[PDB]
Design a protein around this nucleic acid. Sequence first.
RNA 1: GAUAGUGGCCUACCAUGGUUUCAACGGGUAACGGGGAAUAAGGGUUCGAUUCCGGAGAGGGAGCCUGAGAAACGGCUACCACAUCCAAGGAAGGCAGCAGGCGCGCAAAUUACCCAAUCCUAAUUCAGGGAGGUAGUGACAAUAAAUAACGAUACAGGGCCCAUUCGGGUCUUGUAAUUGGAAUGAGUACAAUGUAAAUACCUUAACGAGGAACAACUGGAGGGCAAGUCUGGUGCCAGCAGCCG
Lengths: 144, 53, 134, 182
Amino acid sequence: GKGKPRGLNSARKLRVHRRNNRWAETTYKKRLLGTAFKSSPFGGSSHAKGIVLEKIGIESKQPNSAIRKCVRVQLIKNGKKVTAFVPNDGCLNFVDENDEVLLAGFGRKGKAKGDIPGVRFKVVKVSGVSLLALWKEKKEKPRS
Amino acid sequence: ARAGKVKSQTPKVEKQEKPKQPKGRAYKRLLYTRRFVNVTLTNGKRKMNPSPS
Amino acid sequence: SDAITIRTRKVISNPLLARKQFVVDVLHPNRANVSKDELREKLAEAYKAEKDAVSVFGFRTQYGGGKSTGFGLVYNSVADAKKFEPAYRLVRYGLAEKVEKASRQQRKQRKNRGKKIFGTGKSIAKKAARRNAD
Amino acid sequence: PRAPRTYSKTYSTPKRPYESARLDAELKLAGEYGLKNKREIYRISFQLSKIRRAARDLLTRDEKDPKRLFEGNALIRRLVRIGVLSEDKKKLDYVLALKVEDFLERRLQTQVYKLGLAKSVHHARVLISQRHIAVGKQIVNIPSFMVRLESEKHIDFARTSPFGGARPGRVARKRAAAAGGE
RNA sequence: GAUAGUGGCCUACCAUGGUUUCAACGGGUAACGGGGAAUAAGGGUUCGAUUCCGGAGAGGGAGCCUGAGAAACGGCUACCACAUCCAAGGAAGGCAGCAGGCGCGCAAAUUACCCAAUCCUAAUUCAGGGAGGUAGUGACAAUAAAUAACGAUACAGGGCCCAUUCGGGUCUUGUAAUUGGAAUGAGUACAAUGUAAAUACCUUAACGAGGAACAACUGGAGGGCAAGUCUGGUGCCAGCAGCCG
Ligand SMILES: [Mg+2]
Ligand SMILES: [Mg+2]
Ligand SMILES: [Mg+2]
Ligand SMILES: [Mg+2]
Ligand SMILES: [Mg+2]
Ligand SMILES: [Mg+2]
Ligand SMILES: [Mg+2]
Ligand SMILES: [Mg+2]
Ligand SMILES: [Mg+2]
Ligand SMILES: [Mg+2]
Ligand SMILES: [Mg+2]
Ligand SMILES: [Mg+2]
Ligand SMILES: [Mg+2]
Ligand SMILES: [Mg+2]
Ligand SMILES: [Mg+2]
Ligand SMILES: [Mg+2]
Ligand SMILES: [Mg+2]
């Protein structure tokens, strides 16, 4: 029995069949179609710099309720517009309109985090300095 | 402002000037003493950080 | 005690360069670093050959003192030493004297400048003069 | 375009971070042998593992087969030299049963402690770091030095430093100076 | 015919073949190939611009000269693209060499010293070499490891000579801004090494430890997952939360 061929000269069939099947595995598909380059706002890169258009509070999904404090960013490298969450309690009032910002992914590999709908990106650095540093009061924002 | 209110509210309590911890191998030694040398006050299920209340 | 127990280990006699080459192993006790000159002198005394016919280089202390290991050559004559030993070493010793070049960059620049003229530029100078005038 | 230099990562982290029992064991080990880090322990473990890999491989080959006879034998010899295996157990089968303690009980740390010269492991460690303690008239700075059994007879204080008889130095000297013109 | 020579390599005449479901042909490659690298029961999976070996290319395409060797670009000729200097007649260009700049970006160093070593070139032991080495910058990675060590006294835990109630505590431990002499490189620094000359190392005279220093951070403490239902604040807000929350 068993669906596969077994014979000592099958080989080719085993190969081709495996290849065919591989396309149902999502990661593999992504790798091969190259959807990290063609689609996706970051050009298959770990980080991206963009310019802040405006500051937008986003209402969280259910069980929860709280205005999340995100930022609408337009990335420098391609010109694509994305929403980016600004972490920590203050921090939204470190950003301002027309400011250069360094965005990382959220930590779900393209997918949205937690309860914040349509947001796939963090804010790491504003005007060249780390948000965390600012928050902890280790450095100051050197204007814009 | 909506943002950053809780932090603003909180009383700015300062850190107490303490005797410094002995960092490195010394720290490890200290830890060992705390745990497996002294074996001080054992309930059966041996606790690490008990609440003072 | 100062001691300074000097040893010549791994002695190759080399007629092709008119020298004797060896690993110098020197003992310190309580004294840090032997100094090259002193070592050379010691070698000379040992080997009967002149102090300028001796060359010692490439020393390292044992770690935690006590010993120094290096490399030593003793040439047959001073003339021999002069005509086989590297120039820098000779200079260090005190026999030959420093060659006075400009910084290599300057030299390169000069060379480049020279390249830009065909022949000795006396005619060129004249041309510059007369032409400049009128 | 010069020939590349070889590096090797000499330790391996655990495959599961907060295995509590394991952690406690590690801590205990550290306490026993005055270890600055879990890193040291990990290093030792890695070393052990390498040995085990070799031994297992050797075992997998037929006995009295050349490679096994050679390489395995060499390994055994090395182990005996280091002093981790005992003379009873020159076997290759016993090499698999070694366990981390035997390597730690062979450091220039522990050895120093166990020959006098110390009063506890920490003291010994301090001495080692402080450039007291020489082996073959060679001052050893390294706490995890692995004493080679035949050299274990020679562990003593340095001819430099106090303790092994030279100039007192620094604090004692200062005290002497103070005493002097008073 | 041409070539160094074989060959539809090209030309004339002739024949109708050649490849292909054991994927030809076409398309894509965010493809230089390999040695290898990461992972690591066994089998695999992914990566390999990059130190060695091949191969291409010197902005793009052509075309050639010299020569044993180049279809060479730190040779030339042209065109296209981009560009300098100009007295407007003309003239010069090619950093995917090294250094450096602009731009692009998430993303990468000094317009440093030298041929002493490694080798190479020449008519040549000598000259030349941004090949190469040497320092500068450098938490890319990797190795080794300082941030204390041993004492006393002063309050508690543990063995107990015996438990008429104690208790001496004879023996061992931890904890106190108690206190005590020892040890040291981190630094500095004479020297001497080192070195082409220097740095730094290794070696060392001299200085160099008592808490305020010569101060370890980075993340966590519901679970997964080691660690608090401690004390304030906040009150479905601010926020946290990879997931459940
Ligand atoms: Mg010393
Ligand atoms: Mg390509
Ligand atoms: Mg490839
Ligand atoms: Mg390659
Ligand atoms: Mg590429
Ligand atoms: Mg270019
Ligand atoms: Mg060309
Ligand atoms: Mg060029
Ligand atoms: Mg060229
Ligand atoms: Mg360059
Ligand atoms: Mg970088
Ligand atoms: Mg180079
Ligand atoms: Mg530096
Ligand atoms: Mg903290
Ligand atoms: Mg937190
Ligand atoms: Mg907390
Ligand atoms: Mg837990």
